Ligand binder design. Structure first.
Ligand SMILES: Cc1cc2nc3c(=O)[nH]c(=O)nc-3n(C[C@H](O)[C@H](O)[C@H](O)COP(=O)(O)OP(=O)(O)OC[C@H]3O[C@@H](n4cnc5c(N)ncnc54)[C@H](O)[C@@H]3O)c2cc1C
Ligand SMILES: NC(=O)c1ccc[n+]([C@@H]2O[C@H](COP(=O)([O-])OP(=O)(O)OC[C@H]3O[C@@H](n4cnc5c(N)ncnc54)[C@H](OP(=O)(O)O)[C@@H]3O)[C@@H](O)[C@H]2O)c1
Ligand SMILES: Cc1cc2nc3c(=O)[nH]c(=O)nc-3n(C[C@H](O)[C@H](O)[C@H](O)COP(=O)(O)O)c2cc1C
Length: 608
């Protein structure tokens, strides 16, 4: 589909670069690591560039040996269920079918994954193994970053041993540099000043299909209601009008949205830095050759950049703090910031507890290290991009073809840093009033789907907000019964804390149950009694019937929600069911369930 760029090898020859770092990223982490590695090259006398594999034809890897002392690095994150990130899907398909000989190619791979997921770092492992099979030579061990511990630390550790290994192999030997230049614009046509749009200038005001990540559709918020009964937390239900957008979706899909940071937080960053956020400007790449002309849409004001384009709420990465150290006039403070990039020792410890664990955002660090007064433009060049957030569409297109429903809990907690942290997208979404309140969005097709046959039994497990996609599933299955179709059993295993505090969609669910769309509404109230009652407890309670639906009914199992503990607990209970009724040994029940996943009968929509 995408028109590829001309050979990245030729571009390297023209720009005197010998190292190219590709990033397979869904949410920007692999992208940032790749930019860092690429920039590191310069410190070791080499010259590098980072690149998006989706924009090039990786077959040109076979020409890479034409450049002396050349090397290619892949920072690859895994996504979905042991799948490539969207921007790496093309590269992935090529690796599987090509037969190209990579003799002479030198490579290294750093994988980004999460040990709590079924297939840990599947993509990274695949690319690393495949390049070798194709004939290339590994110049450094595969990196296995784990987002469940601390991914940043894994990268640091890996990066520390990578460069020395690269220098050693090519016999090469080992000062703050800016990637962009500030150009302040005096009196310009507002008609050419970005105000928050993501792609084509003025694309938010002048909407034109097709709509997607690059060209989001600004959907009107037709409804935004509180879902939970109690006041402990704030759970919400929003309905986005996608009429006339020509966007198509199915239950199980995700809808992404581009939020705006908290304006007040943006005002304080400017204030504490003594900068005018209303200045119109551009940050242009000092490398007039790169396709990346700006770190974000330019020209624009800092206010706009800090509001729609930059992430100012997550814990700054170590390289960011490292580059800011130069701006801290107080020695001890400059020392602390500088040591955040350590692979061990008290500097690493301080980074892990004072920045990560305490969840200190950029503003917090500015306040707690008062001698740190970085210029606003450099900071903007260092902050990562503000990512879209995904939400499991909570409606069926068979019933609501022109509306996309969202079920989310607002994020707001007391951090160890002493302040209250707000979730960017949920705080933004929560404040949208139906009145128009517009939400930039797009739909990403998923593989979470109802069975094709209406008669196939369905087993849905989704505690808390994990119920989201199932509301769509249920509406659709109820729709099929109404349409005169023959629908098999539909069981919902939901869980909340108290039926009078956070029982989401209580009225809607009662209805579906009553009318027969829901064969069974099994709800685990985790806090109404002294002991915990979870969804897996209900599954174990119904083990005999569930086995029957699975073994003889060809039922489809779906799990949605917390991927950290809930998914595994639920999965283990399924192991116990299969093990007991097969019967078989645990190890065989585990195989059994894993095959259900390959056969498309055990799907997951788990979050982290
Ligand atoms: C595929 C997919 C589907 C999803 N579906 C939904 C869904 O349907 N409904 C839903 O509600 N969510 C779902 N999400 C999560 C959603 O995408 C957002 O991550 C979530 O809404 C938070 O976004 P935010 O901008 O409000 O918070 P952010 O500003 O992005 O902050 C998120 C971070 O805050 C930190 N944090 C949260 N609570 C605490 C705490 N109490 N203590 C310390 N740190 C904490 C964590 O690091 C968390 O990653 C989904 C995520 C994925 C990936
Ligand atoms: N954006 C998100 O929605 C998002 C993102 C990432 C992770 N998560 C995680 O998903 C989980 C649920 O969050 P939520 O806000 O949707 O609702 P929640 O109220 O935090 O949890 C929903 C229900 O799940 C129960 N539960 C807790 N641990 C369980 C487990 N080990 N196995 C089965 N059930 C368990 C909870 O009981 P108790 O609370 O009484 O133990 C509660 O009854 C949390 O761990 C949350 O951090 C959510
Ligand atoms: C919906 C979703 C699915 C994921 N699936 C996997 C997976 O199968 N295996 C794995 O190792 N990590 C998985 N992860 C974790 C990511 O690989 C990890 O968080 C990575 O740092 C994200 O990088 P990015 O920001 O560069 O895309 C998943 C994360 C999300 C949000």
């Amino acid at each position: 589909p995408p028109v590829k760029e001309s050979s990245f090898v030729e571009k390297m020859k023209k720009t005197g670069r010998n190292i190219i770092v590709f990033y397979g990223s869904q949410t920007g982490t692999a992208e940032e690591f790749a930019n860092r590695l690429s920039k590191d090259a310069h410190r070791y006398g080499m010259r590098g560039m980072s690149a998006d594999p989706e924009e090039y034809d990786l077959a040109d890897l076979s020409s890479l040996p034409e450049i002396d002392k050349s090397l290619v690095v892949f920072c690859m994150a895994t996504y979905g269920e042991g799948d490539p990130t969207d921007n790496a899907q093309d590269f992935y398909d090529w690796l599987q079918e090509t037969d190209v000989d990579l003799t002479g190619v030198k490579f290294a791979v750093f994988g980004l994954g999460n040990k709590t997921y079924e297939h840990f770092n599947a993509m990274g492992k695949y690319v690393d193994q495949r390049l070798e099979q194709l004939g290339a030579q590994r110049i450094f061990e595969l990196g296995l970053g784990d987002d469940d511990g601390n991914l940043e630390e894994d990268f640091i550790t890996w990066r520390e041993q990578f460069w020395p290994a690269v220098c050693e192999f090519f016999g090469v030997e080992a000062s703050s540099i800016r990637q962009y230049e500030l150009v302040v614009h005096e009196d310009m046509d507002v008609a050419k000043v970005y105000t928050g749009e993501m792609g084509r200038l003025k694309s938010y005001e002048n909407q034109k299909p097709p709509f997607d990540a690059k060209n989001p559709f600004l959907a009107a918020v037709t409804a935004n209601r509180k879902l939970n009964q109690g006041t402990e937390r704030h759970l919400m239900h929003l309905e986005l009008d996608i009429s006339d957008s020509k966007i198509r979706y199915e239950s199980g899909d995700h809808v992404a949205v581009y939020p705006a940071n908290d304006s007040a937080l943006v005002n304080q960053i400017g204030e504490i830095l003594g900068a005018d956020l209303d200045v119109i400007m551009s940050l242009n790449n000092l490398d007039e050759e790169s396709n990346k002309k700006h770190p974000f849409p330019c020209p624009t004001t800092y206010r706009t950049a800090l509001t729609y384009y930059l992430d100012i709420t997550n814990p700054p990465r170590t390289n960011v703090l490292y580059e800011l150290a130069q701006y801290a006039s107080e020695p001890s403070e400059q020392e602390h910031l500088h040591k955040m990039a350590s692979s061990s020792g008290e500097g690493k410890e301080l980074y892990l507890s004072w920045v990560v664990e305490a969840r200190r955002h950029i503003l917090a660090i500015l306040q707690d290290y008062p001698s740190l007064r970085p210029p606003i433009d450099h900071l903007c060049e260092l902050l990562p991009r503000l990512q879209a957030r995904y939400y499991s569409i909570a409606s069926s297109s068979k019933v609501h073809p022109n509306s996309v429903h969202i079920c989310a809990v607002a994020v707001e907690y007391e951090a160890k840093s002493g302040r209250v942290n707000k979730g960017v997208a949920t705080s933004w979404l929560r404040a949208k009033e139906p009145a128009r309140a517009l939400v930039p969005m797009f739909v990403r097709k998923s593989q979470f789907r109802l069975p094709f046959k209406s008669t196939t039994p369905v087993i849905m497990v989704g505690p808390g907000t994990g119920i989201a996609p199932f509301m769509g599933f249920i509406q659709e299955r109820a729709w099929l019964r109404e349409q005169g179709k023959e629908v098999g059993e539909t069981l919902l295993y939901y869980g909340c804390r108290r039926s009078d505090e956070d029982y989401l969609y209580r009225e809607e669910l009662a209805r579906f149950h009553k009318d027969g769309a829901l064969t069974q509404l099994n709800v685990a109230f985790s806090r109404e009694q002294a002991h915990k009652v979870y969804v897996q407890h209900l599954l174990k309670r119904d083990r005999e019937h569930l086995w029957k639906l699975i073994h003889e009914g060809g039922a489809h199992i779906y799990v949605c929600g917390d991927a950290r503990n809930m998914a595994k607990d639920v999965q283990n209970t399924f192991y116990d069911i299969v093990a007991e009724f097969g019967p078989m040994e645990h190890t065989q029940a585990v195989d059994y369930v894993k095959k259900l996943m390959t056969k498309g009968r055990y799907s997951l929509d788990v979050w982290s």
